[PDB]
Amino acid sequence: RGRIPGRQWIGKHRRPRFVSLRAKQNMIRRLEIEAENHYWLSMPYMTREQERGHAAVRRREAFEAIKAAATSKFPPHRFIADQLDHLNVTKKWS
């Protein structure tokens, strides 16, 4: 008795979920901090034209640093020391 047609959560008939004061409190809290966000987003500090061209230097130099890091890429250096240290496997006391 008391079964559900098909899957319990989908279709023309599904299991009726109900709301709790717990979830109501949770979401009112979320949306009130979101209203705080709206308030603080309002009242900007500078205007479009005021903040137009201040960070161009930083953006440009950062991108040229990225470019330099990309361009500077080659195989590593090979050394006689690293090559010959392999001979020290046949080390032995006299």
Partner 1 sequence: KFTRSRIPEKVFQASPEDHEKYGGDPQNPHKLHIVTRIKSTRRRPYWEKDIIKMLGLEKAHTPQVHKNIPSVNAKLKVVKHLIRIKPLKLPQGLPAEENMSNTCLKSTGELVVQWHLKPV
Partner 2 sequence: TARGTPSRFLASVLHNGLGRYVQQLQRLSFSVSRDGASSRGAREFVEREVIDFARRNPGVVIYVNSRPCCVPRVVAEYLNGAVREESIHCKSVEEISTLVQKLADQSGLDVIRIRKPFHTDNPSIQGQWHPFTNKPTTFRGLRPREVQ
Partner 3 sequence: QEERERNNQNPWTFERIATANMLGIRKVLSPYDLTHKGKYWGKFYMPKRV
Contacting positions for partner 2 (CB under 8 A) = 88-93
Nearer to partner 3, 7 or 29 (CB): 29
Give yes or no for residue 34 binding partner 3 (CB under 8 A).
yes
Select from 6, 22, 2, 23 the least CA-distant residue to 14.
Answer: 6
Taking contact as CB under 8 A, which single stretch among the options 10-18, 27-35, 69-77, 78-86 is the one that binds partner 3?
A: 27-35
Q: Least distance from C-beta 88 to partner 2, angstroms? A: 7
Q: Which of 51, 64, 82, 85 binds partner 1 (CB under 8 A)?
A: 51
Q: Least distance from C-beta 34 to partner 3, angstroms? A: 4
Select from 20, 19, 17, 22 the least CA-distant residue to 4.
Answer: 17
Give yes or no for residue 20 binding RNA (CB under 7 A).
yes
Buried b (16+ CB within 10 A) or exposed e, 29-65: eeeeeeeeeeeeeeeeeeeeeeeeeeeeeeeeeeeee
